[PDB]
Design a protein around this ligand. Sequence first.
Ligand SMILES: *C=C1C(=O)CC(c2cccs2)CC1=O
Length: 122
Amino acid sequence: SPEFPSEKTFKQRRTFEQRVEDVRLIREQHPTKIPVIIERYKGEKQLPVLDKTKFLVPDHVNMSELIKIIRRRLQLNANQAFFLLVNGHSMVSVSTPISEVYESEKDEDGFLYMVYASQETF
Ligand SMILES: *C=C1C(=O)CC(c2cccs2)CC1=O
């Protein structure tokens, strides 16, 4: 509805220059944390909004563990599907530690971006 404001993403809220410097600050103060931005897919109609956007994830945590953490934050029940996507592909099947996902998939600004949805392609 045009009466209600559109959802604005992290990259629309913070400029690239600010994001680049945020990550430099984060990396300096927390070298063992991965800076992750987790957002709901723009067209999502079945899953609620997350109470935070930026997560400093310990670098040993794997993707299966992170998925459980987000499902819990969203208070999902077991009959609700949830997919976590990085750069256009699903992280749902894997046990890769997030440290490795960061090196493979991080944005130019230094953040690792993830999108969640109730479907795997859209
Ligand atoms: C939103 C967060 C938290 O609630 C705590 C997380 C921590 C993980 C290990 C030590 S603190 C960081 C975070 O982004």
